[PDB]
Amino acid sequence: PYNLSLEVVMAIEAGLGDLPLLPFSSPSSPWSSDPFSFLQSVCHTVVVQGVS
């Protein structure tokens, strides 16, 4: 409803910033063993993006 326009927000592990027009390849670091930090980051990114 209300002429919705779809927007996709990629909640990658990297910090929020302007999307760059250049492919950068770097080695992936191991995931943090604390899931609470990941949950808080996901919640903050969703709130900022207003993800439905």
């Binding site: 063993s33 604390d34 899931p35 609470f36």
Partner: protein, 50 residues
């Protein structure tokens, strides 16, 4: 094989080994305990004949 419950909320990222056996053991007491007495909790885990 009675593994103690895991400690912590972030370190534990697996289900406890003491699962269905622990539930079956817990839902196996049949005595006269408490004011109601005759603890016969079965099926979903609720007593009978109150």
């Amino acid at each position: 094989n009675i593994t103690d419950p895991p400690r912590g909320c972030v370190g534990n990222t697996n289900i406890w080994k003491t699962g269905p056996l622990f539930k079956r053991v817990l839902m196996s007491s049949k005595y006269a305990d408490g004011v109601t007495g005759r603890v016969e909790f079965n099926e979903d885990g609720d007593r009978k004949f109150a």
